[PDB]
């Protein structure tokens, strides 16, 4: 009558987690840490299938964060260390954003010392005593400084995460997807689109734009501590620079280990600053405000500057040609032809929020200028029922993973079970 | 069609073009990674595990007597207690996902039966 029949190739999938690799179309990503390849990609559109998605527990972002940290560490380790720099620095006025400091170091011969001098930003300097003229670097008691490695480039490049054999990626193509819920238009792929691992705070930069209109997403809107990601459809133009003409000196601190520092500054004292197109910014603030009014009832929405705190979390942060800019955005998010914001810069950068590791970025010789697109915002709701009329939002940083969720929220990883059994009229074998 | 193109199609349609899904299981990345990387070891782990899974599935197919058959036909009667639904209903108004979910409890035992059946057949093939 009815007999069993086994089928190989049955299209059924489970939810699963795996080690996804990456691919790219000197630089750490391009020539290390995953393969260079980009053949004709295979994208297909499934029919009559609905798939559930929730971006707020997805192992893609954890894997990407771990890979980014590991790659940066592996890049930093195989070159110069800065243990002899942690000495007493005699600092004086430049003769206002820097200080001229002289200090004693070793040389090519261990029985001889040398006197050298360099310019240092005061954000990289800590005093030793109130009634004294002694100074040291920030991370000389809490970590060990490693110099950013001059021949390698810390420039983001597009990267594609790719699934191994026996796995697949499902992509939600539904317009205006907020990351949680069913998906009625699903596609299958093997490799994600171009993802640029850019690290920034308070302003998402160089990202893919929303398809139709602004998308607002958070893990829990009712909670206030959680970050709110805003994904715009119109990119904003932000171009900015350190214009001061610098010159870097090479200091021999040992047998072949050279330490580069700000040898001198020439020209007029000009401050590093960021320009943003003002009219586009006003338009995008209006669009974000009236879009976010939907999720928050009839209560009015106000924007205010970031609360006081550490420079890393309070100020917007980014990197340009290796120079680390901390910009005070106290006028961008101040609401209810060009807008200019101040930008300090820092050399001893202690990112990844770990301890015992810190990096020193040598200054580029000439001035630095670079242009980019603001493609998203990270906003934080202020807690407390101070008023029942207006709800005020602030710039917000927090976990670095939020910088990548906006690019990885369409994707799901699924395992394939190819073996099935079914009854059929076939008997003979 | 393409890989997993027939997910929404009923089982009768999915019986065609199983070869795309079968062939996708072994396609890989010809390039590899340079030395002294945990990334390289993770990649090696992943692909060795993939090979092991494929080999396990193929061996399980072979023990049942379907060494090189995608749609083979065994000789085990289908107990109605497993899933008692009409042939037309099963092959015309149901996807493979719903089917695999609805007979999840009785899968394991079914496998054992297949084993025994083939073994019996093999023994008879030497006693006849």
């Amino acid at each position, epitope marked *: 009558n009815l007999w069993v029949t086994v089928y190989y190739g049955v299209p059924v999938w*489970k939810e699963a987690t795996t080690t996804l690799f990456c691919a790219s179309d000197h630089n750490v990503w391009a020539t290390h840490a995953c393969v260079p390849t980009d053949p004709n990609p295979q994208e297909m559109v499934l029919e009559n299938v*609905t798939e*559930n998605f929730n971006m707020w527990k997805n192992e893609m972002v954890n894997q990407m964060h771990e890979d980014v940290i590991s790659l940066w560490d592996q890049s930093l380790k195989p070159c110069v260390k800065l243990t002899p720099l942690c000495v007493t620095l005699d600092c004086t006025t430049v003769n206002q954003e820097m200080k001229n400091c002289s200090f004693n170091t070793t040389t090519e011969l261990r029985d001889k010392k040398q006197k050298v001098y360099a310019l240092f930003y005061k954000l990289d300097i800590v005093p030793l005593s109130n009634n004294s003229s002694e100074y040291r670097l920030i991370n000389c008691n809490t970590s060990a400084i490693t110099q950013a490695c001059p021949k390698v480039s810390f420039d983001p490049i597009p990267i594609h995460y790719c699934t191994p054999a026996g796995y697949a990626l499902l992509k939600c193509n539904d317009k205006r997807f907020n990351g*949680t819920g069913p998906c009625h238009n699903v596609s299958t792929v093997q490799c994600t689109h171009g993802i640029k691992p850019v690290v920034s705070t308070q302003l998402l930069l160089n990202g893919s734009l929303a398809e139709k209109e602004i998308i607002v997403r958070s893990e829990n*809107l009712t909670n206030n501590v959680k970050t709110i990601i805003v994904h715009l459809n119109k990119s904003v133009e932000i171009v900015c620079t350190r214009p001061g003409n610098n010159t870097r000196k090479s200091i021999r601190i040992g047998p072949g280990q050279t330490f580069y520092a700000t040898g001198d500054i020439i020209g007029d004292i000009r401050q590093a600053h960021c320009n943003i197109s003002r009219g586009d910014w006003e338009e995008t603030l209006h669009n974000v405000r009236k879009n976010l009014a939907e999720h*928050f*009832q009839n209560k009015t929405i106000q924007f205010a500057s970031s609360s006081g705190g550490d420079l890393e979390i309070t100020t917007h942060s980014f990197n340009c040609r290796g120079e680390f800019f901390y910009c005070n955005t106290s006028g961008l998010f101040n609401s209810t032809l060009t807008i200019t914001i101040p930008c300090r810069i820092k050399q001893i950068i202690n990112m990844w929020q770990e301890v015992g590791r810190a990096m020193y970025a040598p200054p580029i010789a000439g001035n630095i200028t670079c242009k980019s697109n603001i493609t998203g915002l990270l906003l934080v709701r202020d807690g407390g029922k101070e008023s029942n009329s207006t709800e005020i939002f602030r710039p917000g940083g927090g976990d670095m993973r939020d910088n990548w969720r906006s690019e990885l929220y369409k994707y799901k990883v699924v395992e394939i079970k190819p073996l099935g059994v079914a009854p059929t009229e076939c008997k003979r074998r | 069609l393409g890989f997993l193109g027939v997910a929404g199609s009923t089982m009768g349609a999915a019986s065609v073009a199983l070869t795309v899904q079968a062939r996708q299981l072994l396609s890989g990345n010809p390039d590899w990674l340079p030395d002294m990387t945990v990334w390289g070891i993770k990649q090696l782990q992943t692909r060795v595990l993939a090979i092991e899974r494929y080999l396990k599935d193929q061996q399980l197919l072979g023990i049942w007597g379907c060494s090189g058959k995608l749609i083979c036909c065994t000789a085990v009667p289908w107990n109605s207690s497993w899933s008692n*639904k009409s042939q037309t209903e099963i092959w015309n108004n149901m996807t493979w996902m719903q089917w695999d979910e609805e007979i999840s*409890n009785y899968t394991a035992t079914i496998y054992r039966l297949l084993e025994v059946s083939q073994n019996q057949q093999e023994r008879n093939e030497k006693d006849l």
Partner: antibody
Amino acid sequence: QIHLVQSGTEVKKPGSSVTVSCKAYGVNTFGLYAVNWVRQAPGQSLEYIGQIWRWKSSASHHFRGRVLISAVDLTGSSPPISSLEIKDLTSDDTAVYFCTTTSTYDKWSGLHHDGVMAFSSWGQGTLISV
Amino acid sequence: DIQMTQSPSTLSASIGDTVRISCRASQSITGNWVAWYQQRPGKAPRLLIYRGAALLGGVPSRFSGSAAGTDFTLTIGNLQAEDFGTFYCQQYDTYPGTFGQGTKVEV
């Protein structure tokens, strides 16, 4: 972690409409989480009033055209909300109504089928008399 | 529609005893697809078992379920300390679902 807060007891003269509210504390959204309304009268027979699932609302045959089930997603000042509305009430509708929420993300867990499902979380129920 | 009938209607019990409640369906249920619930007087129902014989978390390990072709049996073994109230058998094979009449346990 998951709680369901329901409206208060309210008794009405027969011949009017009634609304009942269910408030899901801890539910991220009504995607991945289906809401099912059930009834329990004296006689201790649990019935099935209706559901909202995948933003589609449906009711059983005994109540088609009689009950409207609505839902609003997570907002800033209010967790997800669901609501029963009975247009007309006879003498036999006196009962305690229960709101239930069930996770629908796994797609392989045994707690749900494509349309009919068990009830993982139960509210405290609203008593209605006529 | 799919009906069910539970048995026994009511049973006495005692601390440390093992009890069994069997619900039979009007149609053989291919998958397990049956659930067991508790309900104390004046409280809300609590899901005990789903998928025929799957045990949730927090519920004690003493409960167990057996799924035959048509008859489903809930085994509450080693009734410890506090006794229980009303037990319920529910099917979710076809739409709409249906609950059983119910059984009561007493000391």
